[PDB]
């Protein structure tokens, strides 16, 4: 069981996370503890989904699950150990900024991880800087599958309470009946711009405020840019009419190719919104390299 592991320090808080060491081999790992409701509801559904789906995925850009240890009252998940998360890295680079080739490199690897997911019928539904990990070599990986789900062809109506507010998609805010892989693409779009401008793109503080921050920037949508928008369960004709503005002011450092890619990831119509597979071929990645942080 656990006699072979020795704890070093507490990392954070799902359950509780620790940094530990294997006494016999010397390997360093990350332990995630989960308590079972022995007298009430049993094993949590979030844990059941996270374990069964992560066992199918094996990719250089997805975190690796090493073992699962059973106990009458507890579960222990054993992960590989990584050095830091992206959010903390962005704060350390507040004064100087992140070099452009490194931005290009990181984004390229993130798209490779997401393409593998969708090819194996899996949605993530919680992509944000705090759930993305890096090492001392130049790699980056996806993490925390506690809100994931396996979908079907075609889709059904799923859970409506999803995605952290600052990174949420417009179709969800309007209470759509059907959503799919397009919502993961939108999250990566907001992350792209945040790396560039050193701050969040739409930091709203309410459900209604979040929606308006998008409108003031991309322009208020109509039936010409988004057919069927006025039939959404939460559409209202009293919405103010703002006009779209220049991308030269949205993301000043970005050039021609970079701005072409960004505007396709932020398309209003989910049908026209670019896919992760098709994005890997964009001219922006013609000269991609792999720098070290």
């Amino acid at each position: 069981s656990m006699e072979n592991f020795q704890k070093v320090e507490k990392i954070g808080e799902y359950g509780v996370v620790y940094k530990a060491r294997n006494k016999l081999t010397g390997e360093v790992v990350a332990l995630k503890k989960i308590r079972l409701d022995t007298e009430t509801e049993g094993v949590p559904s979030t844990a059941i989904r996270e374990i069964s789906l992560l066992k199918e995925l094996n990719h250089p850009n997805i975190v690796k699950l090493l073992d699962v240890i059973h106990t009458e009252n507890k579960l222990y998940l054993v992960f590989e150990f990584l050095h830091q998360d992206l959010k903390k890295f962005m704060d350390a680079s507040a004064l100087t900024g992140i070099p452009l080739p490194l931005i290009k490199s990181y984004l390229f690897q993130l798209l490779q991880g997401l393409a593998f997911c969708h090819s194996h019928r899996v949605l993530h539904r919680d992509l944000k800087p705090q759930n993305l990990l890096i090492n001392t070599e130049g790699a980056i990986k996806l993490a925390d599958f506690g809100l994931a789900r396996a979908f079907g062809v075609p889709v059904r109506t799923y859970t409506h309470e999803v995605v952290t507010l600052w990174y949420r998609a417009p179709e969800i805010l309007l209470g759509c009946k059907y959503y799919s892989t397009a919502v993961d693409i939108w999250s990566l779009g907001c992350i792209f711009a945040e790396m560039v401008t050193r701050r969040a793109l739409f930091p709203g503080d309410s459900e209604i405020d979040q929606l308006f921050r998008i409108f003031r920037t991309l322009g208020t949508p109509d039936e010409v840019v988004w057919p069927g928008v006025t039939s959404m369960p939460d559409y209202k004709p009293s919405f103010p009419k703002w006009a779209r503005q220049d991308f030269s002011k949205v993301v000043p450092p970005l050039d021609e190719d970079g701005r072409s890619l960004l505007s396709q990831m932020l398309h209003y119509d989910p049908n026209k919104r670019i896919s992760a597979k098709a994005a890997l071929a964009h001219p922006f990645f013609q000269d991609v390299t792999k720098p070290v942080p």
Binding site: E41, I48, S52, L53, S119, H120, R121, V153, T159
Partner: protein, 254 residues
């Protein structure tokens, strides 16, 4: 989109790995095929009372056949295995799953709450947490795109559901094959058409390759009104499924 070909290929790969033993019932000393039919028919009723998805039902049957391929069980504990499997399938697939106390209730005071909770943990260990399995239902929704008659769809899911009842002889066919026969048979009964060209190019299944499977299913349809199990027939009488269980089966198929 551009993923539905990658997904279909992957599903054909996983249905081989998630397949039960074909002749397991011969090695179970205390239970039979007749007893298994009684359990499945009861699970169908439960799905109607609490209004659950049809996918949830398909998942539960898959879990049960894999568990009984590895562990010996007496006839008195057979219902306990079924109850815990329907609970796990709900947590995986449903938006609003029923609470544990309600699963205790529908067994009518046969087992305790502590017993249900312990059987849940044992099933997880036996299956090593591998729960995302392909079903007959998953393949049918993809086939439906190659049409758009809504009555042909109801009759197609009717035939597919009937197969879950009888281990002999449907435990020897793969889910993708069962889906293929159920589709063409419903299409020839309603309109009179046949297994589309587009699907032969997609699946690689020809009408000749589906022949042994299709002849088995044809006989099940004819003899349905005299089967000891009747919970499925009455379910598809409802107008929600267009009363498809009232139509008369064809006499020949050529």
């Amino acid at each position: 989109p551009d993923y539905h070909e990658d997904i279909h290929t992957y599903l054909r790969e996983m249905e081989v790995k998630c397949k039960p033993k074909v002749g397991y019932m011969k090695k179970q000393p205390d239970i039979t095929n007749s007893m298994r039919a009684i359990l499945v028919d009861w699970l169908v009723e439960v799905g109607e009372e609490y209004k659950l998805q049809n996918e949830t039902l398909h998942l539960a049957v898959n879990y049960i056949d894999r568990f009984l391929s590895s562990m010996s069980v007496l006839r008195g504990k057979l219902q306990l295995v079924g109850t815990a499997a329907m609970l796990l399938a709900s947590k995986f697939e449903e938006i609003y799953p029923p609470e544990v106390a309600e699963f205790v209730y529908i067994t009518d005071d046969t087992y305790t709450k502590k017993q249900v909770l312990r059987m849940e943990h044992l099933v997880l260990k036996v299956l090593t947490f591998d729960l995302a399995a392909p079903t007959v239902n998953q393949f049918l929704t993809q086939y439906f795109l190659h049409q758009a008659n809504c009555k042909v769809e109801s009759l197609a899911m009717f035939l597919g559901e009937l197969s879950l009842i009888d281990a002999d002889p449907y435990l020897k066919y793969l889910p993708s094959v069962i889906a293929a026969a159920a589709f063409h048979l419903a299409l020839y009964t309603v309109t009179g058409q046949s297994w589309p060209e587009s699907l032969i190019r997609k699946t690689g299944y020809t009408l000749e390759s589906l022949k042994p499977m299709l002849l088995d299913l044809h006989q099940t349809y004819l003899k349905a009104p005299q089967h000891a199990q009747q919970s499925i027939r009455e379910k598809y009488k409802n107008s929600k499924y267009h009363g498809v269980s009232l139509l008369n089966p064809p006499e020949t198929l050529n």
